[PDB]
Design a protein around this ligand. Sequence first.
Ligand SMILES: COc1cc(-c2cncc(-c3ccc(C4CCN(C)CC4)cc3)c2C)cc(OC)c1OC
Ligand SMILES: COc1cc(-c2cncc(-c3ccc(C4CCN(C)CC4)cc3)c2C)cc(OC)c1OC
Ligand SMILES: COc1cc(-c2cncc(-c3ccc(C4CCN(C)CC4)cc3)c2C)cc(OC)c1OC
Length: 282
Amino acid sequence: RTVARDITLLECVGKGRYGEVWRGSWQGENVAVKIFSSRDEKSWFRETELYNTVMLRHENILGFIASDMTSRSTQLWLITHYHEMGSLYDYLQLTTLDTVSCLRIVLSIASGLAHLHIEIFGGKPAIAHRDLKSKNILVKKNGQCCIADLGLAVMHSRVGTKRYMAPEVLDETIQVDCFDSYKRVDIWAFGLVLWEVARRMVSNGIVEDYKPPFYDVVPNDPSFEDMRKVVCVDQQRPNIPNRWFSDPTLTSLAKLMKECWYQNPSARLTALRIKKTLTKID
Ligand SMILES: COc1cc(-c2cncc(-c3ccc(C4CCN(C)CC4)cc3)c2C)cc(OC)c1OC
Ligand SMILES: COc1cc(-c2cncc(-c3ccc(C4CCN(C)CC4)cc3)c2C)cc(OC)c1OC
Ligand SMILES: COc1cc(-c2cncc(-c3ccc(C4CCN(C)CC4)cc3)c2C)cc(OC)c1OC
């Protein structure tokens, strides 16, 4: 039989330290192709090792198609489903949201995250992501999102983006031998993403401009120290605008994001408790 392996690379949709992402075509169908830099080979190995352990299949996890290693140097590609609307970060820049769309986005992210976190017997190991952020979430045409990039993921039976690092990562108190520690770092990051999205939800004719978390207190490409001073020493958290308190949905979302941002990691909500709270809003 013929094993059709040719992928036509059509346009670059992302470039960074990690390498490049391309829209490609296989047998007439769009795929996404991540071509890894030499600098970031261990991300390809860790994602490939994870998928060789458990073939994750979930509507809120970016869909795996293939890992390819080709002898040239060594060329490393990760092939996934393609989401033409791009990342949540991309989408929020010039889209505003209503209540239904905002809730659908954040509950879909919580659903993907709880699926990663939960151990299933007979199944999957528990998985922590370790680099959750709006650039690592894609928007689907149906209004739900999916979580991408398991290059830093850890399983239980490169470091994270500094802007999204939890206080225990910045002050190096994280209990590194404890898998629940890593889930709690993802919940912190989830709360920041929830803040990013909620800002873009309209209420009473008002909306905030897109900003990244901590835009008002750290520079672009903040240092580890910049972040530690804000999050650990001064214990700052993202601003909740007054206008949210006129809207029941944004009032409930503010409470939720507060319960993802406790200094004490074990006080933070779990992904499953966040889902339940989101299903009871509106
Ligand atoms: C190697 O490389 C790539 C391969 C492919 C690809 C192309 N046609 C057919 C296949 C195929 C799948 C599955 C079987 C099964 C059939 C049942 N039997 C009991 C076991 C074997 C056979 C063939 C594949 C996997 C695509 C690629 O990219 C999208 C590849 O490159 C990464
Ligand atoms: C990698 O990805 C894609 C792969 C393929 C594809 C191509 N040839 C053959 C297959 C296949 C056939 C049959 C089995 C068997 C397994 C055991 N038992 C006997 C029942 C079923 C498995 C695999 C597939 C899945 C198509 C795709 O898209 C349409 C893929 O997505 C890009
Ligand atoms: C975060 O991580 C990964 C993401 C992806 C991925 C999957 N679907 C679609 C995309 C995409 C498409 C289109 C745009 C833009 C193009 C310009 N236009 C003006 C707005 C839209 C952006 C993004 C991506 C980047 C694949 C990955 O691996 C293969 C990733 O790595 C795990």
